[PDB]
Symmetry: D3
Subunit: 237 residues, 6 copies
């Protein structure tokens, strides 16, 4: 057991999907996983383990922010033998052509956090996902009839940033989505020799304000989970 995970080696699959909303852990378990079992409840961060088409998979939230997800991803890697971590969440878009409900795959992740500089002797560490996982997610999406967008995400420490102009810089450099974990998870993965990938659906615009019915979300959300799960099966091949 670890400080934030009351479980033992083997309780988690070697692949773990992690939503930002804690409530989504249970939802994913009862909707996509078979024969699921609870493996953690520490601090209310419910963790589950089951199988998807025979493949063992676990699901558990990571909390909002690099600090929070750095804890869970780290403990899972070093103490529970986790090899892959797929973050499934939302993101705000700064580009005009990126619309709500669009699926973005963060091959890379910029950030204004200092965690990676702390790790890389104050130099620039390119926080990146595992290449194979990226391609697995892209193909999985294609197979479902979805055209995902692959590029850079921006992991912000402040949802309410005082530097509004930074969003302009993000757009100017091709940032596809703004979230709050990617860079941190990728940093942890590199630090402890694991693999990671972040998949997000555009929840809103950081310049205007589009609209998406309640159904659209729940539907696109299921689509994102399917992409993640099927990407794992492609990876196993």
């Amino acid at each position: 057991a670890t400080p934030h995970i009351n479980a033992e080696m083997g309780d988690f699959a070697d692949v773990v999907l992690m939503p930002g909303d804690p409530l989504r852990a249970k939802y994913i378990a009862e909707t996509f996983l078979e024969d699921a079992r609870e493996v953690n409840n520490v601090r209310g961060m419910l963790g589950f383990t089951g199988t998807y088409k025979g493949r063992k998979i676990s699901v558990m939230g990571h909390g909002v922010g690099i600090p929070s997800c750095s804890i869970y991803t780290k403990e899972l890697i070093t103490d529970f033998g986790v090899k892959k971590i797929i973050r499934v969440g939302s993101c705000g878009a700064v580009l005009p052509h990126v619309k709500l409900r669009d699926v973005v795959i963060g091959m890379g992740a910029c950030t204004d956090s200092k965690v990676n500089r702390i790790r890389f002797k104050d130099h620039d560490f390119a926080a990146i996902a595992d290449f194979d996982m990226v391609r697995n997610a892209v193909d999985a999406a294609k197979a479902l009839g979805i055209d995902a967008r692959v590029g850079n995400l921006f992991s912000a420490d402040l949802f309410y940033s005082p530097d509004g102009e930074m969003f302009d810089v993000m757009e100017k450099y091709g940032i596809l989505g703004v979230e709050m974990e990617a860079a941190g998870i990728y940093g942890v993965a590199a630090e402890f020799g694991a693999k990671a990938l972040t998949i997000c659906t555009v929840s809103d615009h950081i310049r205007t304000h589009e609209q998406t019915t309640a159904a659209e979300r729940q539907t696109t959300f299921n689509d994102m989970i399917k992409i993640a799960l099927e990407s794992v099966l492609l990876g196993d091949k």
Copy 2:
């Protein structure tokens, strides 16, 4: 309502206690508050509002990490008229004389996060608590027969830091406890003109390893809540 708080102005008291463990919100509500009511459940972050000796008070978790707590504290201040925020949690000690179960009041808060530099034009912003709140907590503790320790806390972005030596620097500079929110909350308070204070009980040593029975914790925890709540009443005077 806000992105992370599904409530309206008035649903929260002007004073809010915020634990790091989400589960503690409900516990505090049913143990110390009277006539409590649920005011939020978004993303599973239960929020409650009641009265303590006639004084209106709300309680709700803030999540682990500066990013997470910066969201909640901000939304509460700007959209729900909150004037005071008291964080109640745990902390790791680096000083030999600071023992487990000790109560530490963070008058100041150092950090390795970049949020404050982002706010202060890359200069040094002294993340501090409201002075009156600090003295209210100190006196409240005294009245309960508890000698609190007042000084600097260190808000770390990484629970599992690669820079072990930094803990040596912390000890050399009088850091009383290492946690993961203070500096961020104090930053938000200064940014939006509110008042904040962080109170923590030593959960462990970052050099050795003492011991505290399960009872000791639950007991000292109740003590910390009492200190916080009574400090509010002293502030009202």
Copy 3:
């Protein structure tokens, strides 16, 4: 003796009040101290030792700037057994509400200097004063019927800064006064294990642009001194 202080262990009291102007030290000693004697003259940085209501007390200028006061405070602590240092000076206001002749107690101090970053491994070190000393100062003020504002000061390296935009930043984040020593003195207090406090009187308002020099301004300066001196008496008890 030291390179900057030509005196011997014992000449100084364990409590030293330090104004920026060395001629101000002479003023303080002759005005408030009984049986005072000059204990230092090096570089014209006058130092004195006498008694206030029977208590042994010393006063000595610290020169302008963090680099200057860092030397004198350090030497007083490591070579003259000084346990407490109270800076009594002036500052410029940036807050509309902060008026001329207002007494400000710097519980914390922000800064443009990099001295604390050098000390704190390039991270954010919250330069704060000793809690008890702040409490004694506030209680002393109250006793004298003098209102006192407790908060953050800003220790600038350049009295004539090339970027006036920082002033709006200070105002936005609640800085009570701009001086040039507090942050440095607190760094030294932490590094060498001593206690320090900074008290200042608003001599000018950078906002409406206005200085203060008259019987009223000189009356307020004396009040600050009285606050400092009486605060140590309360501390002794």
Copy 4:
């Protein structure tokens, strides 16, 4: 024409392969391109344009260092309509498993330079290659039965660094190869909206200390070129 390129819009193909050694460009053009003609000679930075299996292709050295390649890639993109840039060079390994003659595809690139910080408001910009170009390169390698490692490269500013400790840091975080251009080229691609990729062959192992120069090493260099050229053909389809 430009200050560094004495040619006209149309002389270069929309895809340019760029080695660090200008003499290497001559080698590539004569070895793989048909009906190739020199399109630039300024500063001895030879440039050529020809066809590979009917496809118009150009090759031109980029000089050593981020500052050098930043100029040429920028000009090619903004003044010569170049849409894709493929860097084909060498790198030094730090990972025990990465062997000599191994082909490394830099999906991302870390760095000691501050060029991207200047571009990204002093925050962390993840310098990454174009996903499709990386995918085409990997598929091309596969077709040639050539194994290829996809990951992070490290673009150093100093071939002779004063701090060898950074090498252990690179190894700990999985850097596949150390070169001196990738991070800069990716920054330029992002700033000016173009697509770029860096491919390299391990010419030396900084670990066991060993270079590679022979028929086998030259065979591997040609494979990298073949990979690059064939990757563009796949992209066209």
Copy 5:
């Protein structure tokens, strides 16, 4: 008059020699200048104006540290028509071959202060002296038969630096002397359009720990003054 100087235009010469210690300014005036007249006493920072071989000259202390010297140099340049500032202070030696009483001309000045970074958008500003003034000092020394090393000085913010290893870095890069003003004075000269030069007398050796001993605190301190004064005459010619 200015904030820190009670005088009027014309009270100072167009060239001002400035030692860190006000008492040394007084010594210089009484020893080298004829018709010496005190022009300032604010904060005890003595300033004098007189003649040397018919040439009007001023000498005034600047206090310890960059923040202090920046004030006086600025005011002199913008309100008193000062064209040349020649600092005549002391310094600590780091190089083995540099001994006490040695004269050093700082054509350049390194520093760990943030003032120049504040002025130069966080980039590296090479704080250098006026070339003509440098040559004048060299020639002056030659004529007087006094040895003088021309090179880089280090302007430290902390006389009692917590980073001892930095001295090794200074030595490796040939820093001739360690003081606390050069880089700042040069920053002001460039910002406010004036010329400056720093000349120092090795006061002590940082390695051997040998301070200014013997009656060699005069003649040597005088050599520096002689050179500075004679350098001015050469410049006038």
Copy 6:
């Protein structure tokens, strides 16, 4: 031989003139040196050795950028006995009074590169040239009747800087010319124990956008060469 130079000790003179463009190195050799002999061709970075008025002299390109020039200067200093490096390149003017064809002597060199910060523990290293070499150039110019400004140069990493406003900062602080090597060369000279000086010919004006036009690309470029060569002779004397 070295990694980037195919030659042996003795193949180069103890003094090497270095232009950024290899072709200009070739021009210098054939135009100013007798018995010119090509000593290197690796990567096309032409190097030559011959005699000028009886004095053995070498000239070799260093490529564009700090990373490039650092390599060649380093290798020459540690493996070929080079004692003096005199860069003879071009530069862009920011000051209104500086016109094309103007000669500039960089006694100092500012920069936005991180190389010196890497060498100097993130502090400010004043990248300066060798004083004697500077004076030799001034005197040489005087004798030849060629005007020359002695001052600060700016070594930029990005020829196509995204920060246009920085040019205004350069101008305000009197930067004579903008190039891409000075600060780096000086960093190497100090690190590896050698002497260097950078002389540049205003190639274009950053404001007016006037490039090197007319047949004035020779005689002027020659003045620079004449000064550099004659400065060496003076130094030998």
